[PDB]
Tab-separated table of C-alpha atoms and ligand atoms in Angstrom:
chain	number	residue	atom	x	y	z
A	1	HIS	CA	111.462	78.274	24.680
A	2	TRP	CA	107.534	78.436	25.642
A	3	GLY	CA	106.141	81.438	27.390
A	4	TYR	CA	103.886	84.167	27.166
A	5	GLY	CA	105.135	86.677	25.112
A	6	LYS	CA	103.854	87.411	21.167
A	7	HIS	CA	106.185	84.791	19.861
A	8	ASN	CA	105.906	82.025	22.535
A	9	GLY	CA	103.360	82.266	24.189
A	10	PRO	CA	99.768	80.345	24.458
A	11	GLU	CA	98.728	80.269	20.921
A	12	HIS	CA	101.726	78.800	19.736
A	13	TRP	CA	101.705	75.857	22.562
A	14	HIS	CA	99.713	73.531	20.220
A	15	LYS	CA	103.444	73.125	17.913
A	16	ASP	CA	105.333	71.634	20.506
A	17	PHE	CA	102.541	69.940	22.886
A	18	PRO	CA	99.986	68.977	19.945
A	19	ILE	CA	97.976	68.156	23.429
A	20	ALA	CA	96.807	71.933	23.574
A	21	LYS	CA	94.157	71.349	21.093
A	22	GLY	CA	93.083	68.071	23.202
A	23	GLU	CA	89.795	66.942	24.628
A	24	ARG	CA	90.058	68.216	28.187
A	25	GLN	CA	92.668	71.261	28.086
A	26	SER	CA	92.304	73.979	31.145
A	27	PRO	CA	91.565	76.950	31.880
A	28	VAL	CA	87.748	76.865	30.887
A	29	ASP	CA	85.164	79.669	31.387
A	30	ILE	CA	82.455	78.914	34.243
A	31	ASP	CA	79.412	79.368	32.537
A	32	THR	CA	77.806	79.324	36.300
A	33	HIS	CA	74.027	79.128	34.775
A	34	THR	CA	74.903	75.787	33.450
A	35	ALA	CA	77.679	74.078	36.199
A	36	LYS	CA	75.093	71.375	37.685
A	37	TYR	CA	75.048	71.622	40.944
A	38	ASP	CA	75.502	67.832	42.490
A	39	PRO	CA	74.781	66.872	45.942
A	40	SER	CA	76.803	63.414	45.798
A	41	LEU	CA	79.347	65.705	45.703
A	42	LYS	CA	81.328	65.572	48.978
A	43	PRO	CA	83.075	68.138	51.483
A	44	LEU	CA	86.722	69.454	50.264
A	45	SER	CA	88.704	68.395	53.131
A	46	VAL	CA	92.215	70.398	53.513
A	47	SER	CA	94.606	68.644	55.601
A	48	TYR	CA	97.818	71.186	56.004
A	49	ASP	CA	98.444	71.063	59.240
A	50	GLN	CA	101.494	69.424	59.234
A	51	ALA	CA	102.784	71.220	56.081
A	52	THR	CA	106.416	71.250	55.886
A	53	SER	CA	107.108	74.285	53.540
A	54	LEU	CA	110.616	74.174	52.143
A	55	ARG	CA	111.685	76.936	49.210
A	56	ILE	CA	110.278	79.420	47.073
A	57	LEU	CA	111.742	78.973	43.526
A	58	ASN	CA	111.410	81.087	39.755
A	59	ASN	CA	111.514	78.993	37.289
A	60	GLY	CA	110.987	81.700	34.786
A	61	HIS	CA	107.236	81.025	33.709
A	62	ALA	CA	105.962	81.724	38.053
A	63	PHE	CA	107.290	81.349	41.892
A	64	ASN	CA	106.789	77.904	43.404
A	65	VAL	CA	106.332	77.131	47.317
A	66	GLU	CA	107.369	73.748	47.613
A	67	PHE	CA	106.583	71.646	49.906
A	68	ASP	CA	107.971	67.756	51.747
A	69	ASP	CA	105.831	65.453	50.034
A	70	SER	CA	107.503	62.529	51.040
A	71	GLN	CA	104.844	61.297	53.768
A	72	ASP	CA	101.292	62.551	54.108
A	73	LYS	CA	101.879	65.981	56.151
A	74	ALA	CA	99.360	68.154	53.635
A	75	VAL	CA	96.762	66.429	52.279
A	76	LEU	CA	93.594	66.884	49.947
A	77	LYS	CA	91.071	64.824	49.912
A	78	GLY	CA	87.084	64.289	49.799
A	79	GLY	CA	85.448	66.545	47.528
A	80	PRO	CA	84.668	65.372	44.201
A	81	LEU	CA	88.125	62.674	44.395
A	82	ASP	CA	88.453	59.664	45.609
A	83	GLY	CA	92.104	59.028	47.012
A	84	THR	CA	94.773	60.796	48.557
A	85	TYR	CA	96.617	63.468	47.560
A	86	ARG	CA	99.420	65.661	48.167
A	87	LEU	CA	99.973	68.970	48.018
A	88	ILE	CA	103.536	69.086	46.100
A	89	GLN	CA	103.897	73.397	45.329
A	90	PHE	CA	101.403	76.346	44.877
A	91	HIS	CA	102.018	78.940	42.602
A	92	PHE	CA	99.880	82.155	40.355
A	93	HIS	CA	98.762	83.397	37.344
A	94	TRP	CA	98.735	87.189	37.139
A	95	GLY	CA	98.423	89.867	34.900
A	96	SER	CA	99.976	93.165	34.315
A	97	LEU	CA	96.622	95.488	35.208
A	98	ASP	CA	93.967	94.204	37.828
A	99	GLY	CA	91.238	93.703	35.320
A	100	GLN	CA	92.922	90.025	34.486
A	101	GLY	CA	95.699	87.542	35.472
A	102	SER	CA	93.271	84.843	36.226
A	103	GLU	CA	93.166	81.395	34.034
A	104	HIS	CA	89.680	80.228	35.266
A	105	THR	CA	87.031	82.476	33.909
A	106	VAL	CA	83.684	82.822	35.966
A	107	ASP	CA	80.979	83.985	33.334
A	108	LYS	CA	83.917	85.340	31.159
A	109	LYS	CA	84.564	87.699	34.378
A	110	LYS	CA	88.901	87.415	34.930
A	111	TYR	CA	90.056	87.571	38.135
A	112	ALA	CA	94.136	89.728	39.008
A	113	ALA	CA	95.477	86.601	39.941
A	114	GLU	CA	94.581	82.367	40.341
A	115	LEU	CA	96.471	80.372	43.179
A	116	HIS	CA	96.953	77.085	41.768
A	117	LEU	CA	97.127	74.728	44.923
A	118	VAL	CA	99.154	71.800	42.886
A	119	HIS	CA	98.116	67.840	44.499
A	120	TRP	CA	99.757	64.061	43.468
A	121	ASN	CA	97.838	61.524	43.588
A	122	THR	CA	99.517	59.210	46.866
A	123	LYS	CA	98.505	55.700	44.595
A	124	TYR	CA	100.845	56.609	41.990
A	125	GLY	CA	103.852	57.160	44.271
A	126	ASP	CA	105.472	59.514	42.985
A	127	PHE	CA	104.234	63.575	40.448
A	128	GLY	CA	106.242	62.284	37.589
A	129	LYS	CA	103.771	59.197	36.914
A	130	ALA	CA	101.106	60.880	38.697
A	131	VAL	CA	101.076	63.293	35.436
A	132	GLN	CA	100.683	60.656	32.954
A	133	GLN	CA	97.480	59.259	34.951
A	134	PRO	CA	93.504	60.520	33.545
A	135	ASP	CA	93.179	60.755	38.102
A	136	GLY	CA	97.033	61.983	39.350
A	137	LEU	CA	96.237	65.662	40.191
A	138	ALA	CA	94.065	67.400	42.161
A	139	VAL	CA	94.863	71.498	41.167
A	140	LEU	CA	92.714	73.481	43.947
A	141	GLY	CA	92.050	77.096	42.169
A	142	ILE	CA	91.170	80.291	44.391
A	143	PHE	CA	90.804	83.196	42.632
A	144	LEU	CA	92.717	86.475	43.891
A	145	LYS	CA	90.883	90.353	43.276
A	146	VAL	CA	92.279	93.577	45.049
A	147	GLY	CA	90.801	95.131	47.690
A	148	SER	CA	91.872	94.326	51.392
A	149	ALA	CA	95.308	92.826	51.704
A	150	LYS	CA	95.878	89.078	52.564
A	151	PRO	CA	98.215	89.035	55.974
A	152	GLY	CA	98.825	84.984	55.179
A	153	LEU	CA	100.552	86.389	51.912
A	154	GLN	CA	102.600	89.197	53.329
A	155	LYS	CA	105.556	86.537	54.077
A	156	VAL	CA	105.293	85.269	49.845
A	157	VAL	CA	105.704	88.675	48.831
A	158	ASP	CA	108.353	89.919	50.901
A	159	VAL	CA	110.891	87.198	49.878
A	160	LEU	CA	110.655	88.403	46.387
A	161	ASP	CA	113.165	90.560	46.114
A	162	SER	CA	115.355	87.721	46.818
A	163	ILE	CA	114.093	85.485	43.410
A	164	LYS	CA	113.922	88.704	41.068
A	165	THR	CA	115.338	86.200	38.211
A	166	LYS	CA	114.567	82.492	36.749
A	167	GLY	CA	116.558	79.597	38.143
A	168	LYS	CA	116.628	81.987	41.479
A	169	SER	CA	115.248	80.423	45.058
A	170	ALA	CA	115.593	80.659	48.282
A	171	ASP	CA	114.898	79.076	51.570
A	172	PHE	CA	111.111	78.841	52.707
A	173	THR	CA	110.590	76.807	55.524
A	174	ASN	CA	107.178	77.117	57.892
A	175	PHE	CA	105.257	79.101	55.221
A	176	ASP	CA	101.699	78.026	56.487
A	177	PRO	CA	99.108	78.046	53.182
A	178	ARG	CA	95.775	77.343	55.534
A	179	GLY	CA	96.598	81.292	55.427
A	180	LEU	CA	95.609	81.752	52.112
A	181	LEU	CA	92.376	80.520	51.901
A	182	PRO	CA	88.825	81.534	52.315
A	183	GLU	CA	85.890	81.406	53.973
A	184	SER	CA	84.256	79.295	51.901
A	185	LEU	CA	85.166	75.842	50.618
A	186	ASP	CA	81.897	75.701	47.560
A	187	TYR	CA	83.889	74.485	45.106
A	188	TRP	CA	82.919	74.105	40.618
A	189	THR	CA	85.002	70.722	39.450
A	190	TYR	CA	85.937	69.399	35.764
A	191	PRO	CA	88.061	67.465	34.188
A	192	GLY	CA	91.156	69.222	32.835
A	193	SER	CA	94.533	69.747	32.406
A	194	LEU	CA	97.873	71.339	33.545
A	195	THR	CA	97.990	74.810	31.906
A	196	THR	CA	101.568	74.874	30.953
A	197	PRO	CA	103.379	72.746	28.723
A	198	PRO	CA	103.605	69.768	28.919
A	199	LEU	CA	99.734	70.594	29.118
A	200	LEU	CA	98.819	66.664	30.248
A	201	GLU	CA	95.281	65.647	30.700
A	202	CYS	CA	95.941	64.522	34.217
A	203	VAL	CA	93.925	67.063	36.438
A	204	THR	CA	90.740	67.070	38.440
A	205	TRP	CA	90.195	70.802	39.015
A	206	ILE	CA	88.589	71.947	41.757
A	207	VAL	CA	88.015	76.297	41.430
A	208	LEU	CA	86.982	77.866	44.707
A	209	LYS	CA	83.624	80.206	44.293
A	210	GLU	CA	84.864	82.338	46.834
A	211	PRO	CA	87.814	85.134	46.078
A	212	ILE	CA	90.823	85.803	48.133
A	213	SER	CA	91.247	89.550	48.534
A	214	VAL	CA	94.589	91.161	48.604
A	215	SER	CA	96.473	93.961	48.608
A	216	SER	CA	96.943	96.272	45.469
A	217	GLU	CA	100.814	96.432	46.533
A	218	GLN	CA	101.062	93.064	47.030
A	219	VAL	CA	100.070	92.140	43.344
A	220	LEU	CA	102.600	95.147	42.488
A	221	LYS	CA	105.430	92.663	44.093
A	222	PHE	CA	104.455	90.010	41.923
A	223	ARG	CA	104.927	92.572	38.765
A	224	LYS	CA	108.487	92.982	39.696
A	225	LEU	CA	109.502	90.085	39.126
A	226	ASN	CA	111.363	88.626	36.069
A	227	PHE	CA	110.718	86.292	33.349
A	228	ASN	CA	114.639	86.230	32.436
A	229	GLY	CA	117.630	85.520	34.467
A	230	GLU	CA	120.371	87.761	36.162
A	231	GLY	CA	122.140	89.456	33.509
A	232	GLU	CA	120.066	89.496	30.726
A	233	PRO	CA	117.886	91.715	29.241
A	234	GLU	CA	114.961	92.279	31.865
A	235	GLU	CA	111.372	91.346	30.883
A	236	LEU	CA	108.315	91.554	33.727
A	237	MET	CA	106.635	88.255	34.830
A	238	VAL	CA	103.635	89.836	34.057
A	239	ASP	CA	100.401	87.808	32.459
A	240	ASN	CA	101.846	84.799	32.702
A	241	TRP	CA	97.606	82.878	32.190
A	242	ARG	CA	96.900	81.065	29.629
A	243	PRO	CA	93.491	82.029	28.275
A	244	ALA	CA	90.182	80.037	28.559
A	245	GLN	CA	90.135	76.778	26.345
A	246	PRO	CA	87.006	75.103	24.860
A	247	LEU	CA	85.304	72.861	26.678
A	248	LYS	CA	84.251	70.301	24.655
A	249	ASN	CA	82.437	67.287	25.767
A	250	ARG	CA	82.549	68.248	29.832
A	251	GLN	CA	81.139	69.025	32.707
A	252	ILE	CA	81.442	71.844	34.972
A	253	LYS	CA	79.654	70.589	38.573
A	254	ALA	CA	78.977	72.497	41.443
A	255	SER	CA	79.167	71.506	45.200
A	256	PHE	CA	76.258	74.349	46.152
A	257	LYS	CA	73.324	75.634	45.130
B	1	LIG	ZN1	98.887	76.949	37.087
């Protein structure tokens, strides 16, 4: 169907999803000199103490670590947000080479990968209703660079062998997403979209300034995943990132000077 290849990749998505050419598409390049420091932006509140991970799934485009979102167990508030948003899943985008893989860029710099922690606004009741609203989602984006290992990532890396191909899932309980955060919660924010079809313009993006470091071995394991299902020709799950889209009539704000 849509994907990341030569014949079905991002430049083709507008044919099935015309919002791909819309006014608030993501990702974008973050021009750090043009972003506006906004002193009215509050610190982010990340409350992940009671998070309940359940499962990890290869969906053919990335792998999602899924959470129980039927109660306020893992929530994001504050920052640019005016409500309570519940964590539903996180996943990554990454490259075939360490020099690319992120979706957002910073002064045109591409990082090796990018983590998206996806949350939905509880005033809309469920994720499927939230994506139909302009303030439905809050996505926390975190850049990954290759250097020292991230100890909190290793449990994810080690299960990937069990979900090599599209449609495979595995039990994945007791995973603590706090182990994926950098030290600082300084962030940029702007209004945008899902970065995969259906590309809905429902996201408040919150992109952290500080990257996390992961080891070369950790990202190598991401690159052993497959886009295909079992019993089909092997297509490595790499370069599953959408490039930067036009900023159009949007302002990126910074929580820091
Ligand atoms: Zn994503």
